[PDB]
């Protein structure tokens, strides 16, 4: 992967690399000039020549062809795939070029949260875009700030007292949803999920079966991270994740504890947690009830945290759907 990606390289006898936009576990994303389409700047996703990543890239191409046909106008803000090809055995997917990811923008902005009015517009477009996936019998499973990309990330800088530092602000906060390598149809086989992120729905952790509601859980964690600048579940361990949920959201439902086959996490009916160990001391300091994370008692802030609490409902059946989430009072200002 280190060898076929540098700048100046030409792919498929038309795409000329000019910049690197990101490097991850699957491989690379590079910016290219398409010399056979008037010099249109495109984004090309270079996938490692590994079995699991090639199979995911093949499934993502099939999903993208379906979404491009079902939504040719891209009304529902899924990224448009232009074409795909192979290059030295690596699978390459050409995309319409977008801006920075919301994680990238947050990082390059000193990890400062977004203004509430921008969170509102972004949350609405994310819910509409992922509801489009759900209407087409699809589940994304890997929703996170890195996979939410601004259409255009031009900004302005200004100093902010109270923060006592410079703060960037989007000009246009329009976004798109990317990465469909883990996208799963309802009729397809549902796995038990890779290290998906510090966003793992409780039904996913407890192996109770998952579907569309697990996307709603991820969006709720996306919103609080947009509102704070940091995730509320800073961990990669599953039992530690469950202990953070109990501190932030409350106790797990008894029925979910009863059915789960992951006895590894539990001691009888309670979570097998030592709150005086290293991790237990961290969870105590880093975690608190959800509402205590609020930075203002303004009603618009309580409308947002009402939406997050509904999206962070433990039971996947009780959990609000994106169809109902788009009717929430938090989005009344947009109408
Ligand atoms: C390195 O992975 C993290 C992450 C990359 C982002 C942080 C940039 N993953 C990601 N990007 C994708 C697609 C895409 C499409 C258009 C586009 N236009 C400018 S960047 C860009 C990316 C995808 O399928 N996965």
Short mmCIF file of C-alpha atoms and ligand atoms in Angstrom, two decimals:
data_model
loop_
_atom_site.label_atom_id
_atom_site.label_comp_id
_atom_site.label_asym_id
_atom_site.label_seq_id
_atom_site.Cartn_x
_atom_site.Cartn_y
_atom_site.Cartn_z
CA UNK A 1 0.00 0.00 0.00
CA UNK A 2 2.94 2.29 0.74
CA UNK A 3 4.16 2.04 -2.87
CA UNK A 4 1.21 2.66 -5.22
CA UNK A 5 -0.17 5.82 -3.61
CA UNK A 6 2.30 8.74 -3.81
CA UNK A 7 1.65 12.06 -5.52
CA UNK A 8 2.10 12.39 -9.27
CA UNK A 9 1.00 8.80 -9.83
CA UNK A 10 -1.58 8.23 -12.57
CA UNK A 11 -4.37 5.70 -12.00
CA UNK A 12 -6.41 3.94 -14.71
CA UNK A 13 -4.64 6.13 -17.31
CA UNK A 14 -6.76 9.15 -16.35
CA UNK A 15 -6.70 9.91 -12.60
CA UNK A 16 -3.63 11.88 -11.48
CA UNK A 17 -2.95 11.94 -7.73
CA UNK A 18 -2.46 15.40 -6.23
CA UNK A 19 -3.02 14.98 -2.46
CA UNK A 20 -3.76 12.49 0.31
CA UNK A 21 -7.06 13.02 2.13
CA UNK A 22 -6.79 10.27 4.76
CA UNK A 23 -5.19 6.96 5.76
CA UNK A 24 -7.02 4.23 7.64
CA UNK A 25 -7.28 0.51 8.34
CA UNK A 26 -8.79 -0.18 4.90
CA UNK A 27 -6.16 1.87 3.08
CA UNK A 28 -6.06 5.37 1.64
CA UNK A 29 -8.15 8.18 0.18
CA UNK A 30 -6.42 10.43 -2.36
CA UNK A 31 -7.43 13.49 -4.36
CA UNK A 32 -7.10 13.14 -8.13
CA UNK A 33 -7.63 15.00 -11.39
CA UNK A 34 -9.78 13.18 -13.96
CA UNK A 35 -8.17 14.09 -17.28
CA UNK A 36 -10.97 12.35 -19.23
CA UNK A 37 -13.71 14.51 -17.65
CA UNK A 38 -12.48 18.07 -18.09
CA UNK A 39 -10.10 17.87 -15.14
CA UNK A 40 -12.83 17.27 -12.56
CA UNK A 41 -11.30 16.76 -9.13
CA UNK A 42 -12.32 13.41 -7.66
CA UNK A 43 -11.64 11.38 -4.53
CA UNK A 44 -10.28 7.85 -5.00
CA UNK A 45 -10.46 5.23 -2.24
CA UNK A 46 -7.47 2.87 -2.38
CA UNK A 47 -8.24 -0.43 -0.64
CA UNK A 48 -5.56 -2.73 0.76
CA UNK A 49 -5.09 -6.09 -0.97
CA UNK A 50 -6.38 -7.99 2.06
CA UNK A 51 -9.24 -10.49 1.95
CA UNK A 52 -11.54 -8.79 4.46
CA UNK A 53 -11.02 -5.32 2.98
CA UNK A 54 -11.42 -6.50 -0.62
CA UNK A 55 -14.68 -8.29 0.22
CA UNK A 56 -15.93 -5.16 1.99
CA UNK A 57 -14.93 -2.97 -0.97
CA UNK A 58 -16.83 -5.28 -3.34
CA UNK A 59 -19.95 -5.10 -1.17
CA UNK A 60 -19.61 -1.31 -0.91
CA UNK A 61 -19.52 -0.99 -4.71
CA UNK A 62 -22.70 -3.07 -4.97
CA UNK A 63 -24.43 -0.89 -2.36
CA UNK A 64 -23.26 2.32 -4.04
CA UNK A 65 -24.58 1.20 -7.43
CA UNK A 66 -27.95 0.57 -5.77
CA UNK A 67 -28.00 3.96 -4.02
CA UNK A 68 -26.91 5.84 -7.15
CA UNK A 69 -29.80 4.23 -9.04
CA UNK A 70 -32.41 4.69 -6.30
CA UNK A 71 -31.29 8.29 -5.67
CA UNK A 72 -29.67 9.64 -8.86
CA UNK A 73 -30.11 13.27 -7.76
CA UNK A 74 -28.36 12.44 -4.45
CA UNK A 75 -31.34 14.04 -2.69
CA UNK A 76 -30.56 12.00 0.44
CA UNK A 77 -26.88 12.96 0.69
CA UNK A 78 -25.19 9.60 0.22
CA UNK A 79 -21.85 10.08 -1.52
CA UNK A 80 -21.98 9.48 -5.27
CA UNK A 81 -19.66 6.86 -6.75
CA UNK A 82 -18.39 7.79 -10.21
CA UNK A 83 -16.82 4.43 -11.13
CA UNK A 84 -14.45 1.75 -9.85
CA UNK A 85 -11.35 0.01 -11.20
CA UNK A 86 -8.31 -2.01 -10.15
CA UNK A 87 -4.73 -0.79 -9.83
CA UNK A 88 -1.86 -3.22 -9.13
CA UNK A 89 -4.42 -5.61 -7.65
CA UNK A 90 -5.92 -2.98 -5.33
CA UNK A 91 -9.58 -2.03 -5.63
CA UNK A 92 -10.15 1.68 -6.25
CA UNK A 93 -13.49 3.49 -5.94
CA UNK A 94 -13.84 6.95 -7.48
CA UNK A 95 -16.10 9.39 -5.62
CA UNK A 96 -17.37 12.90 -6.02
CA UNK A 97 -14.96 15.12 -4.11
CA UNK A 98 -16.16 16.40 -0.73
CA UNK A 99 -14.53 18.47 2.00
CA UNK A 100 -13.20 17.56 5.42
CA UNK A 101 -14.85 14.94 7.57
CA UNK A 102 -16.57 16.24 10.68
CA UNK A 103 -13.92 14.48 12.77
CA UNK A 104 -11.16 16.04 10.66
CA UNK A 105 -12.69 19.51 11.01
CA UNK A 106 -13.11 19.11 14.78
CA UNK A 107 -9.47 18.03 15.11
CA UNK A 108 -8.04 20.83 12.93
CA UNK A 109 -10.25 23.21 15.03
CA UNK A 110 -8.55 22.25 18.29
CA UNK A 111 -11.32 19.74 19.15
CA UNK A 112 -13.90 22.50 19.75
CA UNK A 113 -17.61 21.60 19.47
CA UNK A 114 -19.97 22.94 16.84
CA UNK A 115 -22.46 25.73 17.43
CA UNK A 116 -25.92 24.41 18.27
CA UNK A 117 -27.50 25.80 15.10
CA UNK A 118 -24.96 23.87 13.02
CA UNK A 119 -25.57 20.67 15.00
CA UNK A 120 -29.28 21.06 14.19
CA UNK A 121 -28.73 21.26 10.43
CA UNK A 122 -26.19 18.42 10.51
CA UNK A 123 -28.31 16.14 12.71
CA UNK A 124 -31.29 16.64 10.39
CA UNK A 125 -29.33 15.80 7.25
CA UNK A 126 -27.69 12.79 8.92
CA UNK A 127 -31.08 11.46 10.03
CA UNK A 128 -32.58 11.99 6.57
CA UNK A 129 -29.60 10.35 4.85
CA UNK A 130 -29.55 7.29 7.12
CA UNK A 131 -33.35 7.02 7.04
CA UNK A 132 -32.92 6.73 3.27
CA UNK A 133 -30.65 3.75 3.94
CA UNK A 134 -33.22 2.25 6.31
CA UNK A 135 -36.08 2.77 3.85
CA UNK A 136 -34.04 0.68 1.39
CA UNK A 137 -33.64 -2.19 3.90
CA UNK A 138 -30.07 -1.22 4.79
CA UNK A 139 -28.08 -0.71 8.00
CA UNK A 140 -24.85 1.29 7.96
CA UNK A 141 -23.41 -0.12 11.26
CA UNK A 142 -20.37 2.21 11.15
CA UNK A 143 -21.72 5.73 11.67
CA UNK A 144 -19.14 8.04 13.23
CA UNK A 145 -17.79 11.60 12.77
CA UNK A 146 -15.06 10.27 10.48
CA UNK A 147 -17.73 8.95 8.08
CA UNK A 148 -19.71 12.22 8.04
CA UNK A 149 -18.14 14.58 5.51
CA UNK A 150 -18.90 18.22 4.77
CA UNK A 151 -19.80 18.93 1.16
CA UNK A 152 -17.57 22.01 1.48
CA UNK A 153 -15.55 22.86 4.60
CA UNK A 154 -14.63 26.51 4.03
CA UNK A 155 -14.61 28.36 7.35
CA UNK A 156 -13.89 31.63 9.14
CA UNK A 157 -11.69 32.32 12.17
CA UNK A 158 -12.50 34.49 15.18
CA UNK A 159 -11.31 34.78 18.78
CA UNK A 160 -13.69 33.59 21.50
CA UNK A 161 -13.52 34.79 25.11
CA UNK A 162 -14.87 32.21 27.59
CA UNK A 163 -12.93 29.73 25.47
CA UNK A 164 -9.94 32.12 25.38
CA UNK A 165 -8.74 30.83 22.01
CA UNK A 166 -9.44 31.08 18.29
CA UNK A 167 -12.48 29.27 16.91
CA UNK A 168 -13.31 28.16 13.37
CA UNK A 169 -16.87 28.24 12.06
CA UNK A 170 -18.36 26.58 8.98
CA UNK A 171 -19.64 28.69 6.10
CA UNK A 172 -21.97 25.93 4.87
CA UNK A 173 -22.48 22.94 7.20
CA UNK A 174 -24.02 20.66 4.56
CA UNK A 175 -22.81 17.07 4.93
CA UNK A 176 -22.80 13.68 3.23
CA UNK A 177 -22.61 10.12 4.57
CA UNK A 178 -19.80 7.84 3.36
CA UNK A 179 -18.31 4.35 3.84
CA UNK A 180 -20.72 1.52 2.97
CA UNK A 181 -18.28 -1.36 3.33
CA UNK A 182 -20.17 -2.70 6.35
CA UNK A 183 -23.64 -1.78 5.04
CA UNK A 184 -25.90 -4.80 5.54
CA UNK A 185 -29.26 -5.64 4.00
CA UNK A 186 -32.10 -7.06 6.08
CA UNK A 187 -32.01 -10.35 4.15
CA UNK A 188 -28.21 -10.57 4.43
CA UNK A 189 -26.26 -12.39 7.13
CA UNK A 190 -25.69 -10.15 10.16
CA UNK A 191 -22.25 -10.53 11.74
CA UNK A 192 -21.23 -9.78 15.33
CA UNK A 193 -19.28 -6.67 14.26
CA UNK A 194 -15.59 -5.72 14.18
CA UNK A 195 -14.05 -3.05 16.41
CA UNK A 196 -16.69 -0.76 14.95
CA UNK A 197 -15.89 2.26 17.20
CA UNK A 198 -16.48 3.65 20.69
CA UNK A 199 -20.02 3.62 19.22
CA UNK A 200 -21.37 0.14 19.94
CA UNK A 201 -25.08 -0.23 20.62
CA UNK A 202 -25.90 -2.35 23.70
CA UNK A 203 -27.71 -4.96 21.60
CA UNK A 204 -24.51 -5.24 19.55
CA UNK A 205 -22.29 -5.70 22.62
CA UNK A 206 -24.67 -8.25 24.17
CA UNK A 207 -25.20 -10.20 20.91
CA UNK A 208 -28.98 -9.86 21.07
CA UNK A 209 -29.32 -9.28 17.33
CA UNK A 210 -29.04 -5.92 15.59
CA UNK A 211 -30.56 -4.00 12.69
CA UNK A 212 -31.60 -0.43 11.89
CA UNK A 213 -31.87 0.75 15.55
CA UNK A 214 -28.11 0.32 16.04
CA UNK A 215 -27.64 3.13 13.49
CA UNK A 216 -29.87 5.35 15.65
CA UNK A 217 -27.64 4.60 18.63
CA UNK A 218 -24.54 5.71 16.71
CA UNK A 219 -26.20 8.97 15.64
CA UNK A 220 -27.02 9.76 19.26
CA UNK A 221 -23.35 9.32 20.14
CA UNK A 222 -22.43 11.44 17.11
CA UNK A 223 -24.63 14.29 18.35
CA UNK A 224 -23.17 14.43 21.87
CA UNK A 225 -19.67 14.34 20.38
CA UNK A 226 -20.63 17.22 18.08
CA UNK A 227 -22.00 19.04 21.14
CA UNK A 228 -18.96 18.44 23.37
CA UNK A 229 -15.96 18.02 21.06
CA UNK A 230 -15.20 14.60 22.56
CA UNK A 231 -16.93 11.24 22.77
CA UNK A 232 -18.83 10.34 25.93
CA UNK A 233 -17.63 6.70 25.68
CA UNK A 234 -13.81 6.98 25.45
CA UNK A 235 -12.95 3.28 25.42
CA UNK A 236 -12.32 0.26 23.21
CA UNK A 237 -13.20 -2.44 25.77
CA UNK A 238 -16.76 -3.78 25.76
CA UNK A 239 -17.26 -4.25 29.50
CA UNK A 240 -15.83 -0.77 30.07
CA UNK A 241 -18.30 0.50 27.46
CA UNK A 242 -21.18 -1.10 29.37
CA UNK A 243 -19.96 0.43 32.64
CA UNK A 244 -19.94 3.87 31.01
CA UNK A 245 -23.53 3.42 29.83
CA UNK A 246 -24.70 2.61 33.36
CA UNK A 247 -23.12 5.79 34.72
CA UNK A 248 -24.38 8.02 31.90
CA UNK A 249 -27.74 6.45 31.01
CA UNK A 250 -28.75 4.28 33.97
CA UNK A 251 -28.97 0.55 34.63
CA UNK A 252 -29.30 -1.94 31.81
CA UNK A 253 -32.78 -3.45 31.34
CA UNK A 254 -33.27 -6.72 33.18
CA UNK A 255 -34.60 -8.54 30.11
CA UNK A 256 -31.50 -7.66 28.08
CA UNK A 257 -29.29 -8.93 30.92
CA UNK A 258 -31.38 -12.11 31.14
CA UNK A 259 -31.21 -13.15 27.48
CA UNK A 260 -27.60 -12.32 26.59
CA UNK A 261 -25.18 -15.21 26.09
CA UNK A 262 -22.23 -12.93 26.94
CA UNK A 263 -22.00 -14.13 30.53
CA UNK A 264 -18.40 -12.86 30.47
CA UNK A 265 -19.64 -9.36 31.32
CA UNK A 266 -21.97 -10.24 34.19
CA UNK A 267 -21.89 -11.55 37.75
CA UNK A 268 -25.42 -12.89 38.29
CA UNK A 269 -27.75 -10.00 37.38
CA UNK A 270 -25.29 -7.10 37.76
CA UNK A 271 -22.35 -6.01 35.64
CA UNK A 272 -19.10 -7.67 36.77
CA UNK A 273 -17.45 -4.33 37.48
CA UNK A 274 -14.79 -3.34 40.02
CA UNK A 275 -15.20 0.41 40.48
CA UNK A 276 -11.94 0.63 42.47
CA UNK A 277 -9.67 -0.82 39.77
CA UNK A 278 -7.82 1.32 37.24
CA UNK A 279 -10.69 1.27 34.74
CA UNK A 280 -13.29 1.67 37.49
CA UNK A 281 -11.58 4.82 38.76
CA UNK A 282 -11.46 6.18 35.20
CA UNK A 283 -15.14 5.48 34.50
CA UNK A 284 -16.09 7.25 37.73
CA UNK A 285 -14.17 10.42 36.88
CA UNK A 286 -14.86 10.55 33.13
CA UNK A 287 -18.58 9.69 33.32
CA UNK A 288 -21.67 11.29 34.82
CA UNK A 289 -25.42 11.38 34.10
CA UNK A 290 -26.23 12.55 30.58
CA UNK A 291 -27.99 15.81 31.47
CA UNK A 292 -25.01 16.99 33.54
CA UNK A 293 -23.03 17.27 30.27
CA UNK A 294 -25.30 20.15 29.23
CA UNK A 295 -23.56 23.49 28.68
CA UNK A 296 -26.75 25.58 28.89
CA UNK A 297 -30.29 25.28 30.21
CA UNK A 298 -31.66 27.03 27.11
CA UNK A 299 -34.67 25.19 25.70
CA UNK A 300 -32.94 24.41 22.40
CA UNK A 301 -30.29 22.59 24.45
CA UNK A 302 -32.96 20.58 26.28
CA UNK A 303 -34.60 19.77 22.94
CA UNK A 304 -31.30 18.35 21.67
CA UNK A 305 -30.65 16.34 24.84
CA UNK A 306 -34.22 15.04 24.67
CA UNK A 307 -33.43 13.71 21.19
CA UNK A 308 -30.12 12.18 22.30
CA UNK A 309 -31.79 10.43 25.24
CA UNK A 310 -34.40 8.92 22.93
CA UNK A 311 -31.70 7.78 20.50
CA UNK A 312 -29.77 6.31 23.46
CA UNK A 313 -32.70 4.16 24.57
CA UNK A 314 -31.42 0.76 25.69
CA UNK A 315 -34.20 -1.35 24.16
CA UNK A 316 -33.76 -1.44 20.36
CA UNK A 317 -37.53 -1.76 19.87
CA UNK A 318 -38.43 1.20 22.09
CA UNK A 319 -35.61 3.20 20.50
CA UNK A 320 -36.85 6.10 18.39
CA UNK A 321 -36.67 5.62 14.64
CA UNK A 322 -35.13 8.19 12.33
CA UNK A 323 -38.59 8.72 10.83
CA UNK A 324 -39.81 9.79 14.27
CA UNK A 325 -36.52 11.58 14.98
CA UNK A 326 -37.06 13.89 11.99
CA UNK A 327 -40.37 14.99 13.56
CA UNK A 328 -38.70 15.97 16.84
CA UNK A 329 -39.11 19.49 18.30
CA UNK A 330 -35.33 19.99 17.99
CA UNK A 331 -35.87 20.29 14.22
CA UNK A 332 -38.89 22.62 14.44
CA UNK A 333 -36.62 25.65 13.99
CA UNK A 334 -35.64 24.30 10.57
CA UNK A 335 -39.29 24.19 9.44
C1 LIG B 1 -9.27 7.15 5.90
O1 LIG B 1 -10.59 6.75 6.25
C2 LIG B 1 -11.27 7.72 7.02
C3 LIG B 1 -12.37 8.33 6.17
C4 LIG B 1 -11.82 9.41 5.24
C5 LIG B 1 -12.20 10.85 5.62
C6 LIG B 1 -11.72 11.20 7.01
C7 LIG B 1 -11.68 11.84 4.60
N1 LIG B 1 -13.10 7.29 5.45
C8 LIG B 1 -13.71 7.25 4.24
N2 LIG B 1 -13.81 8.21 3.33
C9 LIG B 1 -14.53 7.65 2.30
C10 LIG B 1 -14.92 8.21 1.13
C11 LIG B 1 -14.68 9.56 0.61
C12 LIG B 1 -15.39 10.04 -0.49
C13 LIG B 1 -15.19 11.32 -0.99
C14 LIG B 1 -14.25 12.16 -0.37
N3 LIG B 1 -13.95 13.48 -0.74
C15 LIG B 1 -13.05 13.96 0.05
S1 LIG B 1 -12.47 12.92 1.31
C16 LIG B 1 -13.54 11.68 0.73
C17 LIG B 1 -13.74 10.40 1.22
C18 LIG B 1 -14.87 6.26 2.65
O2 LIG B 1 -15.51 5.41 2.02
N4 LIG B 1 -14.31 6.09 3.90
#
